[PDB]
Symmetry: D2
Subunit: 303 residues, 4 copies
């Protein structure tokens, strides 16, 4: 392995071209993105055989400074005329490989830095502000893109995936976990009604990479829509395990978005421990945080 | 000083009595809390001269185990019949001092663990779910309550305050910071139009402690309403500094809630550094994260 | 309340004047600091009645920018000719009040950024490096100073406190917790031999604030020495509780350092849960992390 | 992809069999580990075609609960008679596959939870304590193991890797970064003498997997020795870049440990910004923390 690059390249752009013209699904009211405020955290990695002597000899002649990569990303966010993080990464990657012919490969990660609408009273009524935004530390969209310069000096995308990270959902009832192996290592009781609390990271892969860029936005798959499918399916399903739930979310994703090839789940179990099971004259219960160990599930659903 | 207790006592209750009958303000559509899911993180501290020998002699005869304090809090969340974190703390404090007559003082902090509504498609339409909630890592309500046993064995509340923590608001334009001292220590440029990014922690103190408990809910001041005042005032104001902004927020809070005695602000400046000031054929700009040092301001507004 | 300032002012100085001539104690090998690398994280808070209109009117005429306070601190670390964080805070505070006559109060917190020695080999010989240091995320020294301008324009230190933060100590045996109250809320079993794991924050005040500066190093109390007292007392003591332990550490500190007036403890209990109590042909056991709730103790010992 | 498992399985063992007889090297006096306290954080991932219906149908018949995997790991730490994390992982993997015939693949990560010796006094004689240890949040050893069940039912280790994570080293002088590309994106000044601050994660692979277990300690490569090579090479080298440094560290490791096949580096650049470059009558300078973006390098050196 031989790579180097820059991480935590934060870049905030105001008034990016809005995303509109998206194709709706029943689970989601998502209709586009205003892009008054557009934030991204970019990681860039680059490689190529011509970088060998920067390691073996300390010769920096062909080294693009990682600081310069940061400048490159921030300048290109200013000049970017598209509407998606996915398209931004393609713009950076193509531009970078064109600038630096001795670089053979570039890998990019982009994480949305999300902001939420706020409201203000002016001129007699309360309405969504065009100026004030709330920074959100909850779920955020992601994008991945790698590009290579082939031996004949043409450029090709070699990896492209989009995702949703940091989704934390708890369903207070309508979940069971029963029937698992009960042997000398088992102390978990069967539970026919648990408050299942899952963390979800979901990544999808398009059949056609162009669909991820937003150039024809009807073919784009928005993280907001994926989020709304996850919450709807969770609600609809009498879950039998996290494994069972994520398969059903993946099936719904692929049914709603036939232009997707596959979807990959990383889930974690953070379900609370029960403290009080019965409250006089009430349907309520009391729970608390568990010990640190957490379950996880990794599963790919394919079209 | 001589205190001991328990921190990070997480407790989650389902179907707490709903909060309704609140009094509305123009800045906020807040109308109550469903309380299907109610989460709190409690810190408890206790003191009293009769605890001295637990330190000086290792005599535990009068020590309530901190583990037992955790049990006490969790069991009392199950039996609490009220509607606010503030009222829950009063319930815990009164019950604890009544149980342990050798304790002279108890101090409680309660932090909301907030959850957000999600939506699902069922029976033909998309609607808010009564089952699935999204855990939020953004702003959260807080409550503080201390109680003492007086020499005559009566009980009195000695401190009570409510608050809103973790509010992070950025206003993309309509903010200046000019006219400050420019001397041999100054390298900050004057800025007539900055994207002010503030973190806000807001704490309010009622004239009458009973108004914080929700027993007469029309007198309650909800953190949600405070949040909406902050975003509205930020939007409305051509800010001249963070100092200027928080004074105006405080004035609006005290105008909207005449039952409050005072409001206290802790603010932090996290405004981004500018990278690209002019983008062709666009009003947008590009910013990035600053170095770690952050400004802060602390100010009390009184009725 | 009315203050503002700057937090997370990191400043790293190479080749500060070495701290020499400190009085050693039997518990610690500490004899000074080479100060090849000296790191501090400073927080500065300033107040004064003349700051009022910066809040109430948006008037910035008397506003020292918080950015300028950062410059002030970093420049004064370059010009500081002393040998301790405590003395550095005094230098900054005096300098700041002499510079800005409208400031009536300044509060400073200084936290050591600790580095540990590393070893290197030169012509076969292994010895401590004078060039390479390891950044430590473990315990660190602290200092606090509050200075006021009196009506007659003299400057007075009204509060001074030094400390050690982030010390995490586990004693595998020789600890008990028995004899505490057992009632309807008590599930904690009595334990005659637990692996007590405590977090310690230890703060001390001098009888004479001048002794904190290091000008007469024989009177200076080093956080390193406090660390080694704490571990030695923990080792020696068959502890009966954390309360019992911290009182005994405090007594030993005050015996070793008669120039101190008080020692204040903030401790937390993070003792592991036992999983396997008996291992064949072994004295060992297996433990794991507990649930999040943690006990804490707060206690002052006075000279 | 189809796996599931358990993360953050903390397990602490007292009086593990000591590691002794480790061959020393010039750069390190390390010869073994007393193992009075042995802490590990384990992540376990398992797979197998027979797990399919646990996802596709919600059938839990062949689901080992992740909670039971936690119990399995903690119980096996109690019964483990070896001396290394690498060997512990082999013990867990082999035992798990022997127990659960439907599992075809197991992947394990083990991270040391490191503790440091402390001082205690006995009759004025200061010595290392056999009871009190300091929990360290600095660098720590790692181990990785993947084991598969073949069609002929033999068990085979397909990947094994050891490592050191979290090493943070700063060298105050004797580092340059010059001669890199200067074009339209370059603003970084050349620096002939910078205080290079690197984060290092170092991983190695053995020619023979059996050498990683420690059964013959003379063939075992300890993370502590790798740590000491890294600090020594950093000191000795007039570095020309991080790339240059990590190649030289890798070469030294492979020279000292001919039983290793490769060393893999993940480094990060966290070098401070210079604030004051000249201090009168002093060689010192003042630096501060940079903006968030960080450089990184990834590189494999082979035997
Ligand atoms: O949904 C679940 N899947 C699992 O594999 C599991 N193991 N313990 N609890 C669990 N819950
Ligand atoms: O609003 C602000 N107040 C301040 O005091 C300040 N100092 N630097 N920037 C600032 N912005
Ligand atoms: O040392 C202790 N002090 C306490 O107060 C306590 N409570 N539970 N466990 C405890 N341990
Ligand atoms: O050691 C370094 N390598 C790099 O690639 C680099 N880029 N900017 N600074 C740097 N320092």
């Amino acid at each position: 392995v031989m790579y180097y690059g820059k991480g935590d390249v934060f870049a905030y752009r105001t008034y990016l071209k809005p995303l509109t013209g998206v194709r709706t699904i029943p689970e989601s009211p998502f209709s586009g993105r205003d892009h008054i405020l557009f934030g991204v955290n970019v990681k860039i990695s680059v490689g190529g055989t011509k970088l060998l002597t920067s390691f073996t000899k300390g010769d920096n002649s062909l080294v693009v400074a990682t600081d310069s990569m940061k400048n490159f990303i921030q300048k290109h966010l200013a000049s970017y005329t598209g509407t998606t993080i996915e398209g931004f990464l393609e713009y950076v990657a193509t531009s970078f490989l064109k600038k630096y012919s001795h670089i053979e490969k570039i890998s990019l990660i982009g994480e949305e830095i999300p902001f939420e609408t706020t409201f203000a009273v002016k001129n007699g009524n309360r309405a969504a502000s065009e100026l004030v935004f709330k920074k959100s530390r909850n779920e955020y969209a992601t994008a991945y893109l790698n590009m290579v310069r082939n031996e004949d000096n043409t450029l090709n995308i070699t990896e492209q995936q989009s995702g949703l990270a940091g989704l934390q959902l708890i369903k207070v009832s309508g979940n069971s976990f029963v029937g698992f192996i009960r042997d000398e290592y088992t102390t978990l009781p069967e539970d026919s009604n648990r408050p299942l609390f899952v963390y979800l990271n979901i990544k999808w892969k398009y059949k056609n990479t162009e669909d991820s860029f937003g150039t024809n936005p009807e073919n784009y798959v928005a993280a907001e829509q994926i989020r709304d499918i996850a919450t709807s399916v969770f609600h609809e399903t009498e879950t039998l395990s996290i494994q069972h739930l994520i398969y059903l979310i993946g099936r719904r994703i692929l049914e709603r978005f036939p232009q997707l090839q596959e979807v990959y789940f990383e889930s974690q179990n953070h379900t609370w421990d029960k403290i009080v099971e019965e409250i006089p004259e009430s349907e309520g219960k009391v729970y608390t945080e568990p010990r640190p160990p957490y379950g996880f599930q990794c599963f790919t659903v394919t079209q």
